Structures are given as structure tokens and as C-alpha cells.
């Protein structure tokens, strides 16, 4: 009921989690779809770090804000840690 846009350097994953769900299971989803260990995947929210303990209900991912027509975005960085590496897509004017 809360839709997320996972954002790597260029990769983007459109996930659909529940109203109040733990960060652990979405982290596991990201691990399963990218085949990487969890120790280099830390989820961000507007330049704010997160750990594997909180939930989407109190993080700010309100179902009235993460509507699928404009899902709320999160960031990831991968460590062989790295900061936010979000690249804007483009914007050609009319």
C-alpha cells in the first residue's frame, strides 16, 4: 500500500510494500533482485540514513504521500561506504 522507487547510481526498482512494514524485508527484496549481501545496502530518505530496525509507518512513507502515481523515492549506495549518488534523468523543454 506504500510504493517505493529504489534508486542506485542509475538502477531503479519499483517496489510495493505494506502500510507498516519493516526495512528488513524490503532490504531482503533488494538483495534478492540484485544478488548482493546486505552489509553494503543502506537505505536513505532525503539525505537521512536508515538502519534495519525502523518501519515505513513512522518513517514518513504515508500512503497519502507514496501514492503509486508519484511514489516516494529512496536512495541506495553500494560499498566494496558511499554517499547519495542519485542522478536526475533528464528534462528537455518544450
Amino acid at each position: 500500500d506504500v510504493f517505493l522507487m529504489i534508486r542506485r547510481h542509475k538502477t531503479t526498482i519499483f517496489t510495493d510494500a505494506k502500510e507498516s512494514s519493516t526495512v528488513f524485508e524490503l532490504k531482503r527484496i533488494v538483495e534478492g533482485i540484485l544478488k548482493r549481501p546486505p552489509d553494503e545496502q543502506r537505505l536513505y530518505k532525503d539525505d537521512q540514513l536508515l538502519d534495519d530496525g525502523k518501519t515505513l509507518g513512522e518513517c514518513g512513507f504515508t500512503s497519502q504521500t507514496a501514492r503509486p502515481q508519484a511514489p516516494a523515492t529512496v536512495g541506495l549506495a553500494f560499498r566494496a561506504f558511499e554517499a547519495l549518488c542519485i542522478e536526475p534523468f533528464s528534462s528537455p523543454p518544450e
Partner: protein
């Protein structure tokens, strides 16, 4: 199942397959000798769709799979005037 969408900018756009099969040609692109029956990547590359439009079409995939049957309020899809022209062409190309 998750499938990848590659724009002309190189932006991978991994989307759940059941949402990504709403568009006709993505269903057609994965059909035929593009199936690649190994379940490793399952990617299709769009050489002429920009990333700022694949973002909108993926958001539409999620929006339509969410509101396909809920004929209650059906909130409006937010389309910017800048994105409006190329989004129509992308939906035409993808038979979205």
C-alpha cells in the same frame, strides 16, 4: 518476477513483471527469441525512450495495476506539460 527496462540514458528501471506486461510491446519484446529462459536478468533495452519518460511509464504501470478495478475515485495521473508529448509517443510505441 522482475524485469529490467533500459532507457537511452542507460537508466535501468527494474519493474515487477506482472506490472510491466500491461504494455503490449514489452509483452511482445519478452516473447519470441527474447525470452531468455534462465531467469537471470530478463531485460529489454529501449534505444529511443528517455529515462525521464520510462520513469513515468513505470509509475503508470504501478498506477494501472493498482487502480485497474477500484472504480471508486480513480485519482488523476500527474503529467507535466514538459513530459506530455514524449509520454504520448512512448505509450504509443509500447501500446501502453
Amino acid at each position: 518476477m522482475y524485469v529490467k527496462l533500459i532507457s537511452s540514458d542507460g537508466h535501468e528501471f527494474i519493474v515487477k513483471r506482472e506490472h510491466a506486461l500491461t504494455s503490449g510491446t514489452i509483452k511482445a519484446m519478452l516473447s519470441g527469441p527474447g525470452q531468455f529462459a534462465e531467469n537471470e536478468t530478463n531485460e529489454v533495452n529501449f534505444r529511443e525512450i528517455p529515462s525521464h519518460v520510462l520513469s513515468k511509464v513505470c509509475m503508470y504501470f504501478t498506477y494501472k495495476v493498482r487502480y485497474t478495478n477500484s472504480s471508486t475515485e480513480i485519482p488523476e495521473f500527474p503529467i507535466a506539460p514538459e513530459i506530455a508529448l514524449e509520454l504520448l509517443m512512448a505509450a504509443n510505441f509500447l501500446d501502453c
